[PDB]
Design an enzyme around this catalytic site. Structure first.
Site, short mmCIF file in Angstrom:
data_model
loop_
_atom_site.label_atom_id
_atom_site.label_comp_id
_atom_site.label_asym_id
_atom_site.label_seq_id
_atom_site.Cartn_x
_atom_site.Cartn_y
_atom_site.Cartn_z
N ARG A 85 10.05 19.19 55.79
CA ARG A 85 9.56 18.81 57.13
C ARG A 85 8.48 17.75 56.94
NH1 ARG A 85 5.87 21.45 59.29
NH2 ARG A 85 5.55 23.37 58.11
N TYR A 233 17.07 17.43 55.54
CA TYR A 233 16.38 18.62 54.99
C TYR A 233 15.93 19.62 56.05
CZ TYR A 233 14.02 21.26 51.41
OH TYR A 233 13.65 22.23 50.52
N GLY A 234 16.28 20.89 55.85
CA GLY A 234 15.59 22.07 56.40
C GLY A 234 15.13 21.91 57.84
N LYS A 242 13.11 25.21 63.60
CA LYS A 242 11.73 24.97 64.12
C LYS A 242 11.78 24.16 65.43
CE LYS A 242 9.58 26.90 60.67
NZ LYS A 242 8.81 28.14 60.84
N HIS A 262 5.73 32.07 65.75
CA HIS A 262 5.95 31.95 64.29
C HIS A 262 5.64 33.30 63.65
CE1 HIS A 262 5.08 29.49 60.39
NE2 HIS A 262 6.33 29.96 60.42
N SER A 284 1.55 29.11 55.76
CA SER A 284 2.27 28.88 54.48
C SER A 284 1.57 29.62 53.34
CB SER A 284 2.35 27.40 54.20
OG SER A 284 1.05 26.82 54.18
N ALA A 285 2.35 30.14 52.38
CA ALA A 285 1.87 30.66 51.08
C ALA A 285 1.00 31.91 51.29
CB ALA A 285 1.11 29.58 50.35
N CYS A 286 1.28 32.70 52.33
CA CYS A 286 0.56 33.96 52.65
C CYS A 286 1.49 35.18 52.59
CB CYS A 286 -0.06 33.88 54.04
SG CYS A 286 -1.44 32.72 54.09
N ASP A 309 10.63 35.00 60.23
CA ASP A 309 10.04 33.68 60.56
C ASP A 309 9.73 33.50 62.05
OD1 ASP A 309 9.04 31.13 59.53
OD2 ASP A 309 10.83 30.21 60.44
N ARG A 403 14.48 26.18 48.37
CA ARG A 403 14.87 27.17 49.39
C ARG A 403 16.10 27.95 48.95
NH1 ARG A 403 11.08 27.94 53.41
NH2 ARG A 403 9.68 26.16 53.04
O1 LIG Z 1 10.07 22.02 54.88
C1 LIG Z 1 11.11 22.52 55.42
O2 LIG Z 1 12.03 21.90 55.91
C2 LIG Z 1 11.21 24.00 55.66
S1 LIG Z 1 9.62 24.61 56.36
C3 LIG Z 1 10.00 26.34 56.74
C4 LIG Z 1 11.23 26.86 56.40
C5 LIG Z 1 11.52 28.18 56.67
C6 LIG Z 1 10.59 28.98 57.32
N1 LIG Z 1 9.40 28.49 57.66
C7 LIG Z 1 9.05 27.19 57.37
C8 LIG Z 1 7.77 26.78 57.77
O3 LIG Z 1 7.41 25.59 57.47
O4 LIG Z 1 6.98 27.61 58.34
MN LIG Z 2 8.00 29.36 59.07
#
Ligand SMILES: O=C(O)CSc1cccnc1C(=O)O
Ligand SMILES: [Mn+2]
Ligand SMILES: [Mn+2]
Ligand code: NA
EC number: 4.1.1.32
Length: 619
Positions: A85, A233-234, A242, A262, A284-286, A309, A403
């Site tokens: 993202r 991507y994602g 999202k 979220h 993130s990262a929690c 999520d 991922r």
């Molecule tokens: O960077 C990306 O495209 C994926 S970011 C993401 C993916 C799955 C669940 N949560 C997130 C997020 O950024 O919170």
């Molecule tokens: Mn997320």
């Protein structure tokens, strides 16, 4: 009608029929076919046959590799320019900027990125005309939520990426049943292109089509449109993940009286056979996925996963806060996923899973930083950059944002009501952040208004300052990158729930798994031991007298936490509240809310700021 032969795209349909689509779906598909000039149109049916054949095709063109160690698992390695993202190229279009972000008092908004209608029309015209030349336009009809659900919403995603089609099959409910269900109903129009029309104008890297320079992820909530160009991507390309799930849905939620958040959703059952659903919002990262799939250490306790999520929540006629997971899959961060940190994720991802930017073992398995599992003598590693890699090598074997994309139905602890159309009744909401200092393991908000303040005040240590040094950044409600509209109006929307007749307002908690001692050592063992904090929350929801008042809210009484089998935990340091720390903390929250929310800061949030300041002042 037409005076020539360029408007009717019927002759280019290679699966399905334009004639069979609902009127407004045909206009959306055919209008974008006219604009983007795809060679073919494939109306997706969601069948296993379609899916298997598309994977085999991507395998032929070198876009994915089969992972031979596992059952029907696949690996995509991207262009290193397209790995995440990109917030700075993610925008929301509204007539007035204030409808999208509060106008800050002094600084730049970090609560969204507004783009004028005028700038978007110019950006759109510079990207989409002819952008699918030589490619198939796939038409993905998908449901966000169980197909019948009163809380579900339908989208149609147009894409020129087979990777997106395959990933959307996992992450959403897609195919013919969705078109039949939609009929002449409203839907979210989702348009995606990798932005690499054939013949290619620029080099193709790692068989991964992208256009980094023109990458733009746009949301037009007033037109019910998501338009995304240049990233495969994602969260840029899987427009349910999202763009729909949080940005469009949060605006729909505001309009319609519900919440798009979220949050993970889990079900927890105690030794007395009582079950409660909880939602939790972490940055993130929690460890959201780790909590959502927790293997509890306490005997007689069970955790089950509804989602990891996104939560869509609506107070029903009876006042219960009913939540669905609008997704169909988990799109989890692969690095740090181990048998120790997430044994249920390890079980889930061994079949029917697509991996992106992880390392591959020579026996056709996956590897990443923190997998915490040795390889048998002989087994070698290819990095996510398709180069030979050794554990002593100084770059990681997997991209930090790599991922797994896995069906939710495969999680061995998926909750039996994870697809119930009525949703599950939320009894507690948990906020949290990574705070190495000052913030107790757990506290409980004094009221709904205090709880909304606790959400608004969330902060968390960033992975870096981005050279070596830590930053404590603000991430209100874990929604900072995801607000669909003005954050002040979102706070007002949350506060308005207290005035909804019959509403059973969930208890609000804040957790910190990451508090450290003087030497930088974690004070709390975490992982399955987090079940001990959930047990305390469970009892508080039942009305147990297990709390002591502090200036920040309720914390566990002396002897309230079950520490049986942890030996000696330092509860004094873990629950310590310093006047000096909290004086600084309230000042940073004040400066933040004043600048970033400014004229749109609700009265009740300012009052909660004043009240916390006053309670700290009496220490
Ligand atoms: O960077 C990306 O495209 C994926 S970011 C993401 C993916 C799955 C669940 N949560 C997130 C997020 O950024 O919170
Ligand atoms: Mn997320
Ligand atoms: Mn080919
Ligand atoms: Na590739």
């Amino acid at each position: 009608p037409q005076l020539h032969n360029g408007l009717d795209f019927s002759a280019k349909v290679i699966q399905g029929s334009l004639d069979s689509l609902p009127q407004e779906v045909r206009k959306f598909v055919e209008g974008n076919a006219q604009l983007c000039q795809p060679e073919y149109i494939h109306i997706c049916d969601g069948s296993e046959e379609e899916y298997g054949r598309l994977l085999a095709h991507m395998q032929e063109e070198g876009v994915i590799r089969k992972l031979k160690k596992y059952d029907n698992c696949w690996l995509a390695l991207t262009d290193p320019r397209d790995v995440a993202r990109i917030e700075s190229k993610t925008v929301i279009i509204t007539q007035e900027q204030r409808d999208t972000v509060p106008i800050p008092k002094s600084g730049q908004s970090q609560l969204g990125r507004w783009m004028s209608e005028e700038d978007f029309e110019k950006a759109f015209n510079a990207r989409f005309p002819g952008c699918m030349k030589g490619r198939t336009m796939y038409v993905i009809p998908f449901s966000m939520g169980p197909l019948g659900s009163p809380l579900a919403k339908i989208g149609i995603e147009l894409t020129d990426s087979p990777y997106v089609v395959a990933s959307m099959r996992i992450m959403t409910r897609m195919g013919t049943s969705v078109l039949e269900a939609l009929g002449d109903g409203e839907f979210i129009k989702c348009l995606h292109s990798v932005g690499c029309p054939l013949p290619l104008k620029k080099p193709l890297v790692n068989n991964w089509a992208c256009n980094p320079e023109l990458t733009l992820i746009a949301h037009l909530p007033d037109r019910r449109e998501i338009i995304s160009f240049g990233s495969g991507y994602g969260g840029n390309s899987l427009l349910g993940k999202k763009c729909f799930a949080l940005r469009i849905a949060s605006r729909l939620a505001k309009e319609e009286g519900w919440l798009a958040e979220h949050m993970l959703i889990l079900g927890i059952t105690n030794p007395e056979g009582k079950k409660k659903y909880l939602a939790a919002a972490f940055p993130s990262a929690c460890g959201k996925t780790n909590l959502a799939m927790m293997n509890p250490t306490l005997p007689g306790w069970k955790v089950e996963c509804v989602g990891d999520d996104i939560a869509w929540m609506k107070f029903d006629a009876q006042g219960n806060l009913r939540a669905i997971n609008p997704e169909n899959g988990f799109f989890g961060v692969a690095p740090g996923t181990s048998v120790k940190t997430n044994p249920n994720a390890i079980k889930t991802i061994q079949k029917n899973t697509i991996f992106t930017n992880v390392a591959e073992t020579s026996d056709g398995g996956v590897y990443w930083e923190g997998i915490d599992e040795p390889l048998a003598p002989g087994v070698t590693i290819t990095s996510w950059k398709n180069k030979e890699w050794r554990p002593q090598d100084e770059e990681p074997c997997a991209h930090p944002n790599s991922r797994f994309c896995t069906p939710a139905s495969q999680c061995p602890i998926i909750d039996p009501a994870w697809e119930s159309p009525e949703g599950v009744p939320i009894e507690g909401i948990i906020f949290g952040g990574r705070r190495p200092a000052g913030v107790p393991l757990v506290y409980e908000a004094l009221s709904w208004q205090h709880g909304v303040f606790v959400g608004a005040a969330m902060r968390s240590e960033a992975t870096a300052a981005a050279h070596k040094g830590k930053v404590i950044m603000h991430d209100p409600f874990a929604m900072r990158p995801f607000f669909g509209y003005n954050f002040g109006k979102y706070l007002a929307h949350w506060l308005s729930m207290a005035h909804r007749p019959a509403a059973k307002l969930p208890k609000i908690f804040h957790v910190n798994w990451f508090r450290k001692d003087k030497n930088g050592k974690f004070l709390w063992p975490g992982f399955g031991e987090n079940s001990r904090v959930l047990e305390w929350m469970f009892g508080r929801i039942e009305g147990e007298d297990s709390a002591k008042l502090t200036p920040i809210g309720y914390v566990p009484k002396e002897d309230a936490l079950n520490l049986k089998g942890l030996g000696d935990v330092n509860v004094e340091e873990l629950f310590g509240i310093s006047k000096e720390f909290w004086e600084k903390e309230v000042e940073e929250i004040d400066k933040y809310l004043e600048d970033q929310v400014n004229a749109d800061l609700p009265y009740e949030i300012e009052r909660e700021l004043r009240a916390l300041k006053q309670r700290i002042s009496q220490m």
